[PDB]
């Protein structure tokens, strides 16, 4: 390898115990209250998700090699598709070019496996 | 050319693969382009073909199939029982067994 210009960071990977995890935009990495990096990439392969972190070079000298990872978050609805359903009594006027579908007209269903 | 249709979500915690397909009676009519989260409400921004909205009635409902997944927000390294003197090595990998998924509190 060759020495970088400045602001060098080291990459570290994290395996997700639950597949299908998603990461929020601009997620940070902390250690004892201090931000030490950020989450750059996230790849799905089969039934496992891996996270790629970017910790500062100087900050990784303080994290023990036997430390654990704690990921906070909430359960959300991960949707894959959107489908319009023909109503029981359809309207003559088609969908207008600038239409809005109210939330009461939306049906959230769980997929089958 | 495409036209934009917006859709409100019954759940604020809704994510979607970018460029997910929008279908009507088996055939694809467009794709979702963006999701706006103003406040605690989610609004989908669809983009469907111009010649496809003539077949979709104005009073058509929307079905969205998906799964309940974990929406991570932050990653934190936790000091162990007894920290080892050797620091984290570059390109190290922490296995899924050493990962703890916790739900955050809400007031």
Numbering used by the authors:
A (entry chain B): 32 to 144
B (entry chain A): 39 to 145
Quoted from the paper:
It is now well demonstrated that Mce1 is involved in the transport of mycolic acid/fatty acids and Mce4 imports cholesterol. A common feature of each of these proteins is that they all contain a conserved domain of approximately 100 residues, now referred to as the MCE domain, which is characterized by a seven-stranded β-barrel fold, although the sequence identity of these domains is very low.
Despite extensive trials, only MtMce4A39–140 crystallized readily in several conditions in space group P65. Although Matthews coefficient calculations suggest the presence of 6–8 molecules in the asymmetric unit, assuming a solvent content of about 50%, the solved structure showed that only four molecules are present in the asymmetric unit, corresponding to a solvent content of about 71%. The structure was refined at 2.9 Å resolution. The domain-swapped dimer is formed by the extension of residues 107–141 from one molecule into the other molecule. The swapped region contains two β-strands and an extended loop [Fig. 3(a)]. The residues from 107 to 141 are exchanged between the two monomers to complete the signature MCE fold. In comparison to the homologs from E. coli (EcMlaD, EcPqiB and EcLetB) and A. baumannii MlaD (AbMlaD), the overall MCE fold with a seven-stranded β-barrel is conserved in the domain-swapped dimer of MtMce4A39–140. The dimer appears to be selectively crystallized, for example favored by better crystal contacts, compared with the monomer.
